[PDB]
Design a protein around this ligand. Structure first.
Ligand SMILES: CC[C@H](C)C(=O)O[C@H]1C[C@@H](C)C=C2C=C[C@H](C)[C@H](CC[C@@H](O)C[C@@H](O)CC(=O)O)[C@H]21
Length: 400
Protein backbone atom coordinates (compact mmCIF):
# COMPACT_ATOMS: atom_id res chain seq x y z
CA UNK A 1 0.00 0.00 0.00
CA UNK A 2 3.10 2.08 -0.33
CA UNK A 3 2.27 2.19 -4.05
CA UNK A 4 -1.24 3.68 -3.85
CA UNK A 5 -0.45 5.68 -0.71
CA UNK A 6 2.75 7.19 -2.16
CA UNK A 7 1.05 7.97 -5.48
CA UNK A 8 -1.83 9.74 -3.72
CA UNK A 9 0.69 11.89 -1.86
CA UNK A 10 2.38 12.68 -5.18
CA UNK A 11 -0.98 13.65 -6.70
CA UNK A 12 -1.71 16.08 -3.87
CA UNK A 13 1.70 17.64 -4.56
CA UNK A 14 2.93 17.07 -0.99
CA UNK A 15 5.76 14.68 -2.01
CA UNK A 16 7.85 14.24 -5.13
CA UNK A 17 8.73 10.60 -4.47
CA UNK A 18 10.27 7.98 -2.22
CA UNK A 19 13.10 5.46 -2.00
CA UNK A 20 12.54 2.13 -0.20
CA UNK A 21 15.15 -0.62 0.31
CA UNK A 22 14.60 -3.76 2.38
CA UNK A 23 16.17 -7.22 2.57
CA UNK A 24 16.45 -10.32 4.72
CA UNK A 25 19.91 -11.45 5.82
CA UNK A 26 20.54 -13.80 2.87
CA UNK A 27 19.18 -11.54 0.17
CA UNK A 28 16.29 -13.92 -0.59
CA UNK A 29 13.49 -11.45 0.05
CA UNK A 30 14.66 -8.16 -1.45
CA UNK A 31 12.46 -5.13 -2.09
CA UNK A 32 13.92 -2.03 -3.75
CA UNK A 33 11.60 0.65 -5.12
CA UNK A 34 12.17 4.24 -6.17
CA UNK A 35 8.92 6.14 -6.75
CA UNK A 36 8.09 9.45 -8.34
CA UNK A 37 10.41 12.19 -9.59
CA UNK A 38 13.22 14.53 -8.56
CA UNK A 39 13.76 18.09 -9.77
CA UNK A 40 17.12 19.24 -11.06
CA UNK A 41 18.44 22.73 -10.40
CA UNK A 42 17.49 23.57 -14.01
CA UNK A 43 13.85 22.75 -13.22
CA UNK A 44 14.02 19.54 -15.28
CA UNK A 45 12.32 16.44 -13.87
CA UNK A 46 13.72 12.89 -13.77
CA UNK A 47 12.31 9.64 -12.35
CA UNK A 48 13.36 8.89 -8.81
CA UNK A 49 16.07 6.23 -8.90
CA UNK A 50 17.52 3.78 -6.41
CA UNK A 51 20.97 5.38 -6.74
CA UNK A 52 19.80 8.93 -6.02
CA UNK A 53 21.97 10.46 -3.26
CA UNK A 54 19.84 11.01 -0.18
CA UNK A 55 20.27 13.21 2.85
CA UNK A 56 20.41 10.80 5.79
CA UNK A 57 20.05 13.42 8.57
CA UNK A 58 19.95 11.48 11.88
CA UNK A 59 20.26 8.15 10.10
CA UNK A 60 23.90 9.28 10.19
CA UNK A 61 23.79 8.45 13.92
CA UNK A 62 23.74 4.69 13.25
CA UNK A 63 26.83 4.94 11.06
CA UNK A 64 28.66 7.11 13.59
CA UNK A 65 27.69 4.55 16.24
CA UNK A 66 29.40 1.81 14.21
CA UNK A 67 32.52 3.94 13.72
CA UNK A 68 32.74 4.50 17.50
CA UNK A 69 32.27 0.78 18.22
CA UNK A 70 35.02 0.01 15.69
CA UNK A 71 37.30 2.28 17.75
CA UNK A 72 36.28 0.20 20.78
CA UNK A 73 37.36 -2.92 18.86
CA UNK A 74 40.70 -1.25 18.08
CA UNK A 75 41.26 -0.54 21.78
CA UNK A 76 41.22 3.22 21.17
CA UNK A 77 38.05 3.65 23.28
CA UNK A 78 35.86 1.67 25.65
CA UNK A 79 32.11 1.89 26.24
CA UNK A 80 32.28 2.77 29.94
CA UNK A 81 35.68 4.51 30.09
CA UNK A 82 36.17 8.12 31.18
CA UNK A 83 36.08 10.55 28.21
CA UNK A 84 37.13 13.62 30.23
CA UNK A 85 40.65 13.64 28.82
CA UNK A 86 39.72 13.21 25.13
CA UNK A 87 36.69 15.52 25.45
CA UNK A 88 37.50 18.10 28.15
CA UNK A 89 34.65 20.26 26.82
CA UNK A 90 32.24 17.53 27.95
CA UNK A 91 33.89 17.21 31.38
CA UNK A 92 33.51 20.97 31.92
CA UNK A 93 29.74 21.11 31.40
CA UNK A 94 27.64 21.57 34.53
CA UNK A 95 24.15 20.13 35.04
CA UNK A 96 21.19 22.50 34.68
CA UNK A 97 18.48 21.42 37.15
CA UNK A 98 15.99 24.22 36.50
CA UNK A 99 15.33 27.88 37.23
CA UNK A 100 14.24 30.08 40.15
CA UNK A 101 11.13 32.24 40.34
CA UNK A 102 13.15 35.24 39.13
CA UNK A 103 14.26 32.90 36.29
CA UNK A 104 17.84 32.38 37.64
CA UNK A 105 19.62 29.21 36.47
CA UNK A 106 20.29 26.44 38.98
CA UNK A 107 23.16 24.16 37.96
CA UNK A 108 25.40 21.63 39.73
CA UNK A 109 28.81 20.19 38.90
CA UNK A 110 28.69 16.81 37.12
CA UNK A 111 28.59 13.85 39.50
CA UNK A 112 30.56 11.47 37.26
CA UNK A 113 32.40 11.35 33.93
CA UNK A 114 30.72 11.12 30.54
CA UNK A 115 31.29 7.85 28.66
CA UNK A 116 30.95 6.66 25.10
CA UNK A 117 27.98 4.50 26.05
CA UNK A 118 26.19 7.60 27.35
CA UNK A 119 26.95 9.54 24.16
CA UNK A 120 25.68 6.69 21.95
CA UNK A 121 22.44 6.32 23.96
CA UNK A 122 21.49 9.99 24.60
CA UNK A 123 21.89 9.50 28.34
CA UNK A 124 24.89 11.81 28.81
CA UNK A 125 22.84 14.94 29.44
CA UNK A 126 23.68 16.64 26.12
CA UNK A 127 20.26 17.63 24.76
CA UNK A 128 19.08 19.35 21.60
CA UNK A 129 18.04 22.88 22.54
CA UNK A 130 15.00 22.61 20.23
CA UNK A 131 13.62 19.59 22.12
CA UNK A 132 14.63 20.53 25.67
CA UNK A 133 12.71 23.58 26.97
CA UNK A 134 15.09 24.10 29.89
CA UNK A 135 18.13 24.10 27.58
CA UNK A 136 16.08 26.21 25.16
CA UNK A 137 15.52 28.81 27.89
CA UNK A 138 19.19 28.73 28.92
CA UNK A 139 20.20 29.26 25.29
CA UNK A 140 17.93 32.28 24.97
CA UNK A 141 19.61 34.07 27.90
CA UNK A 142 23.33 33.24 28.18
CA UNK A 143 23.82 32.68 24.44
CA UNK A 144 23.08 35.43 21.90
CA UNK A 145 25.32 34.27 19.02
CA UNK A 146 23.81 35.75 15.88
CA UNK A 147 27.15 35.58 14.07
CA UNK A 148 26.89 33.09 11.25
CA UNK A 149 30.52 32.00 11.62
CA UNK A 150 31.05 28.27 10.97
CA UNK A 151 31.46 26.27 14.16
CA UNK A 152 33.05 22.96 14.99
CA UNK A 153 31.03 20.40 16.92
CA UNK A 154 32.59 21.61 20.18
CA UNK A 155 31.86 25.27 19.28
CA UNK A 156 28.24 24.54 18.36
CA UNK A 157 27.07 22.48 21.36
CA UNK A 158 28.04 24.76 24.24
CA UNK A 159 25.02 24.11 26.48
CA UNK A 160 25.12 22.59 29.96
CA UNK A 161 23.98 19.06 30.58
CA UNK A 162 20.27 18.57 31.06
CA UNK A 163 20.76 15.95 33.80
CA UNK A 164 23.47 14.13 35.65
CA UNK A 165 25.41 11.81 33.26
CA UNK A 166 23.80 8.39 33.07
CA UNK A 167 20.58 9.27 34.94
CA UNK A 168 18.32 10.62 32.18
CA UNK A 169 17.49 10.36 28.50
CA UNK A 170 17.17 13.16 25.99
CA UNK A 171 17.87 13.18 22.27
CA UNK A 172 20.84 15.40 21.48
CA UNK A 173 24.37 15.87 20.07
CA UNK A 174 25.80 12.74 21.66
CA UNK A 175 26.82 11.34 18.27
CA UNK A 176 28.35 14.61 17.14
CA UNK A 177 30.48 14.40 20.29
CA UNK A 178 31.24 10.73 19.60
CA UNK A 179 32.30 11.57 16.06
CA UNK A 180 34.66 14.23 17.46
CA UNK A 181 36.04 11.67 19.90
CA UNK A 182 36.66 9.29 16.98
CA UNK A 183 38.58 12.02 15.15
CA UNK A 184 40.66 12.89 18.22
CA UNK A 185 41.70 9.29 18.96
CA UNK A 186 42.31 8.30 15.32
CA UNK A 187 44.09 11.49 14.29
CA UNK A 188 42.08 11.94 11.08
CA UNK A 189 38.63 13.04 9.89
CA UNK A 190 35.42 11.12 10.63
CA UNK A 191 34.89 10.60 6.88
CA UNK A 192 38.40 9.18 6.45
CA UNK A 193 37.74 6.64 9.20
CA UNK A 194 34.27 5.73 7.86
CA UNK A 195 35.53 5.44 4.28
CA UNK A 196 38.23 3.03 5.40
CA UNK A 197 36.34 1.04 8.02
CA UNK A 198 32.69 1.08 6.86
CA UNK A 199 32.30 2.22 3.25
CA UNK A 200 35.30 0.47 1.63
CA UNK A 201 34.52 -3.01 3.08
CA UNK A 202 30.97 -2.68 1.72
CA UNK A 203 32.02 -1.29 -1.66
CA UNK A 204 30.41 2.09 -0.90
CA UNK A 205 31.90 4.99 -2.89
CA UNK A 206 28.99 7.42 -3.24
CA UNK A 207 29.00 9.00 0.20
CA UNK A 208 29.98 12.39 1.63
CA UNK A 209 29.29 14.50 4.73
CA UNK A 210 27.77 17.94 4.38
CA UNK A 211 28.91 19.88 2.45
CA UNK A 212 28.64 17.62 -0.60
CA UNK A 213 31.40 18.97 -2.84
CA UNK A 214 31.71 16.02 -5.25
CA UNK A 215 30.39 16.86 -8.71
CA UNK A 216 29.26 13.27 -9.35
CA UNK A 217 27.27 13.25 -6.12
CA UNK A 218 25.79 16.73 -6.70
CA UNK A 219 24.45 15.52 -10.06
CA UNK A 220 22.35 12.95 -8.11
CA UNK A 221 21.44 14.87 -4.92
CA UNK A 222 17.66 14.72 -4.51
CA UNK A 223 17.96 17.83 -2.29
CA UNK A 224 19.76 19.92 -4.94
CA UNK A 225 16.73 21.54 -6.56
CA UNK A 226 15.11 24.99 -6.94
CA UNK A 227 13.57 24.81 -3.44
CA UNK A 228 16.94 23.97 -1.89
CA UNK A 229 19.74 25.40 -4.08
CA UNK A 230 22.15 25.01 -1.16
CA UNK A 231 21.37 21.29 -0.93
CA UNK A 232 20.91 21.78 2.83
CA UNK A 233 18.43 18.92 3.21
CA UNK A 234 15.54 21.24 4.08
CA UNK A 235 12.79 18.90 2.85
CA UNK A 236 14.11 16.08 5.07
CA UNK A 237 14.25 18.04 8.34
CA UNK A 238 11.01 19.99 7.82
CA UNK A 239 12.65 23.28 6.84
CA UNK A 240 15.84 25.17 7.44
CA UNK A 241 19.30 23.79 6.97
CA UNK A 242 20.61 26.24 9.57
CA UNK A 243 22.66 23.67 11.38
CA UNK A 244 24.35 22.32 8.27
CA UNK A 245 24.98 25.88 7.06
CA UNK A 246 26.53 26.89 10.39
CA UNK A 247 28.79 23.91 10.77
CA UNK A 248 32.43 23.20 10.20
CA UNK A 249 33.76 19.67 9.95
CA UNK A 250 31.78 16.44 9.93
CA UNK A 251 28.71 16.15 12.11
CA UNK A 252 28.19 12.57 13.25
CA UNK A 253 24.70 13.42 14.38
CA UNK A 254 23.23 14.33 11.02
CA UNK A 255 25.69 15.16 8.31
CA UNK A 256 25.82 12.17 5.93
CA UNK A 257 24.54 11.79 2.36
CA UNK A 258 24.18 8.28 0.91
CA UNK A 259 22.08 6.25 -1.54
CA UNK A 260 19.29 4.04 -0.26
CA UNK A 261 21.08 1.05 -1.79
CA UNK A 262 24.27 1.82 0.11
CA UNK A 263 22.46 2.46 3.40
CA UNK A 264 20.70 -0.91 3.32
CA UNK A 265 24.11 -2.59 2.77
CA UNK A 266 25.06 -1.27 6.22
CA UNK A 267 21.78 -2.45 7.75
CA UNK A 268 22.16 -5.84 6.22
CA UNK A 269 25.71 -6.39 7.45
CA UNK A 270 24.41 -5.86 11.00
CA UNK A 271 21.37 -8.08 10.34
CA UNK A 272 23.44 -10.97 8.97
CA UNK A 273 26.21 -10.28 11.54
CA UNK A 274 28.70 -11.15 8.82
CA UNK A 275 31.79 -9.63 10.46
CA UNK A 276 32.23 -7.03 7.71
CA UNK A 277 32.01 -4.07 10.15
CA UNK A 278 32.16 -5.46 13.70
CA UNK A 279 32.78 -8.80 15.37
CA UNK A 280 29.55 -10.75 16.00
CA UNK A 281 29.63 -10.30 19.77
CA UNK A 282 29.98 -6.52 19.44
CA UNK A 283 26.99 -6.43 17.07
CA UNK A 284 24.95 -8.57 19.53
CA UNK A 285 25.75 -6.04 22.25
CA UNK A 286 24.12 -3.29 20.11
CA UNK A 287 20.68 -4.95 20.46
CA UNK A 288 20.50 -4.60 24.27
CA UNK A 289 18.99 -2.08 26.68
CA UNK A 290 21.90 0.22 27.57
CA UNK A 291 19.97 2.74 29.68
CA UNK A 292 20.19 2.12 33.39
CA UNK A 293 17.04 2.21 35.53
CA UNK A 294 16.84 5.97 36.08
CA UNK A 295 17.75 6.74 32.46
CA UNK A 296 15.16 4.21 31.22
CA UNK A 297 12.44 5.89 33.29
CA UNK A 298 13.43 9.25 31.80
CA UNK A 299 13.30 7.73 28.29
CA UNK A 300 9.76 6.51 28.95
CA UNK A 301 8.73 9.91 30.24
CA UNK A 302 10.09 11.45 27.03
CA UNK A 303 8.12 8.82 25.09
CA UNK A 304 4.88 9.93 26.84
CA UNK A 305 5.63 13.63 26.33
CA UNK A 306 4.31 15.74 23.42
CA UNK A 307 7.51 14.81 21.52
CA UNK A 308 6.87 11.11 22.18
CA UNK A 309 5.57 10.33 18.67
CA UNK A 310 8.93 11.37 17.21
CA UNK A 311 10.78 9.42 19.90
CA UNK A 312 8.69 6.25 19.36
CA UNK A 313 9.58 5.90 15.64
CA UNK A 314 6.10 4.54 14.98
CA UNK A 315 6.05 1.90 17.73
CA UNK A 316 2.84 1.62 19.74
CA UNK A 317 2.64 3.24 23.23
CA UNK A 318 1.87 -0.25 24.66
CA UNK A 319 5.15 -1.71 23.38
CA UNK A 320 7.96 -1.89 25.89
CA UNK A 321 11.13 -0.26 24.54
CA UNK A 322 14.64 0.69 25.55
CA UNK A 323 17.57 2.40 23.82
CA UNK A 324 20.34 0.31 22.30
CA UNK A 325 23.61 1.22 20.63
CA UNK A 326 22.24 2.87 17.52
CA UNK A 327 18.57 3.59 18.15
CA UNK A 328 15.33 2.65 19.85
CA UNK A 329 15.15 -1.01 20.88
CA UNK A 330 11.89 -2.90 21.17
CA UNK A 331 11.76 -5.13 24.22
CA UNK A 332 8.84 -7.36 23.17
CA UNK A 333 7.38 -8.98 20.04
CA UNK A 334 4.61 -7.47 17.97
CA UNK A 335 3.22 -10.43 16.01
CA UNK A 336 3.20 -9.69 12.30
CA UNK A 337 5.49 -6.69 12.87
CA UNK A 338 8.79 -5.89 14.69
CA UNK A 339 10.20 -8.74 16.71
CA UNK A 340 11.65 -8.06 20.12
CA UNK A 341 15.04 -6.34 20.05
CA UNK A 342 14.34 -4.61 16.76
CA UNK A 343 16.63 -1.58 16.47
CA UNK A 344 15.08 1.41 14.73
CA UNK A 345 15.58 5.13 14.16
CA UNK A 346 15.40 7.63 11.32
CA UNK A 347 16.31 11.00 9.94
CA UNK A 348 14.37 14.25 10.04
CA UNK A 349 10.65 13.86 9.47
CA UNK A 350 10.86 11.81 6.24
CA UNK A 351 13.20 8.84 6.72
CA UNK A 352 13.12 5.80 8.98
CA UNK A 353 15.07 2.52 9.17
CA UNK A 354 14.82 -0.70 11.20
CA UNK A 355 16.84 -3.87 11.84
CA UNK A 356 14.70 -6.83 12.99
CA UNK A 357 16.99 -9.74 13.78
CA UNK A 358 14.27 -11.95 15.26
CA UNK A 359 12.16 -11.90 12.09
CA UNK A 360 15.19 -11.53 9.76
CA UNK A 361 14.32 -8.25 8.06
CA UNK A 362 15.85 -4.80 7.76
CA UNK A 363 15.00 -1.77 5.67
CA UNK A 364 15.02 1.97 5.10
CA UNK A 365 12.16 4.11 3.79
CA UNK A 366 13.04 7.66 2.76
CA UNK A 367 10.24 9.99 1.65
CA UNK A 368 11.28 12.84 -0.66
CA UNK A 369 8.95 15.63 0.50
CA UNK A 370 7.91 18.97 -1.02
CA UNK A 371 8.37 22.17 0.97
CA UNK A 372 6.56 23.12 3.14
CA UNK A 373 6.67 19.67 4.68
CA UNK A 374 3.38 18.26 5.99
CA UNK A 375 4.65 16.64 9.18
CA UNK A 376 1.46 14.70 9.87
CA UNK A 377 1.48 13.20 6.39
CA UNK A 378 5.16 12.25 6.73
CA UNK A 379 4.34 10.22 9.86
CA UNK A 380 1.60 8.36 7.99
CA UNK A 381 3.87 7.72 4.98
CA UNK A 382 6.64 6.37 7.21
CA UNK A 383 4.18 4.12 9.07
CA UNK A 384 2.85 2.91 5.73
CA UNK A 385 6.36 1.82 4.73
CA UNK A 386 7.05 0.26 8.14
CA UNK A 387 3.92 -1.94 8.02
CA UNK A 388 3.55 -2.58 4.28
CA UNK A 389 7.09 -3.93 4.04
CA UNK A 390 6.11 -6.67 6.53
CA UNK A 391 2.96 -7.33 4.49
CA UNK A 392 5.13 -7.76 1.39
CA UNK A 393 7.53 -10.00 3.34
CA UNK A 394 4.73 -12.30 4.53
CA UNK A 395 3.20 -12.49 1.06
CA UNK A 396 6.58 -13.56 -0.32
CA UNK A 397 7.14 -16.12 2.45
CA UNK A 398 3.67 -17.50 1.79
CA UNK A 399 4.46 -17.96 -1.90
CA UNK A 400 7.41 -20.31 -1.25
C1 LIG B 1 19.36 17.60 12.53
C2 LIG B 1 18.70 16.24 12.32
C3 LIG B 1 18.03 15.65 13.58
C4 LIG B 1 19.03 15.19 14.64
C5 LIG B 1 17.20 14.49 13.12
O1 LIG B 1 17.28 14.44 11.87
O2 LIG B 1 16.44 13.56 14.09
C6 LIG B 1 15.12 13.05 13.71
C7 LIG B 1 15.09 11.52 13.67
C8 LIG B 1 13.78 10.91 14.17
C9 LIG B 1 13.85 9.39 14.26
C10 LIG B 1 13.51 11.45 15.56
C11 LIG B 1 13.53 12.77 15.72
C12 LIG B 1 13.17 13.35 17.04
C13 LIG B 1 13.01 14.67 17.16
C14 LIG B 1 13.05 15.57 15.92
C15 LIG B 1 11.66 15.63 15.30
C16 LIG B 1 14.13 15.08 14.94
C17 LIG B 1 14.19 15.93 13.68
C18 LIG B 1 14.63 17.36 14.00
C19 LIG B 1 14.66 18.21 12.73
O3 LIG B 1 13.38 18.09 12.09
C20 LIG B 1 14.93 19.68 13.09
C21 LIG B 1 16.40 19.95 13.40
O4 LIG B 1 17.21 19.90 12.22
C22 LIG B 1 16.57 21.33 14.03
C23 LIG B 1 16.18 22.42 13.07
O5 LIG B 1 16.13 22.22 11.75
O6 LIG B 1 15.90 23.53 13.51
C24 LIG B 1 13.92 13.62 14.53
Amino acid sequence: HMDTTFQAAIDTGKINGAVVCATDAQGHFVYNKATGERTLLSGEKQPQQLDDVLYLAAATKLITTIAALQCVEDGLLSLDGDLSSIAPELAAKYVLTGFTDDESPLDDPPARPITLKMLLTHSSGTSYHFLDPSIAKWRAQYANPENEKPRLVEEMFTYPLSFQPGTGWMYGPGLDWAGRVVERVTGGTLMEFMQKRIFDPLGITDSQFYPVTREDLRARLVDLNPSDPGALGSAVIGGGGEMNLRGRGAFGGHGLFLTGLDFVKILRSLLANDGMLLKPAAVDNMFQQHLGPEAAASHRAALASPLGPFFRVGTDPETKVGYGLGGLLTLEDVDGWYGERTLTWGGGLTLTWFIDRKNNLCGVGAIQAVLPVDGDLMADLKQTFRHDIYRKYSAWKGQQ
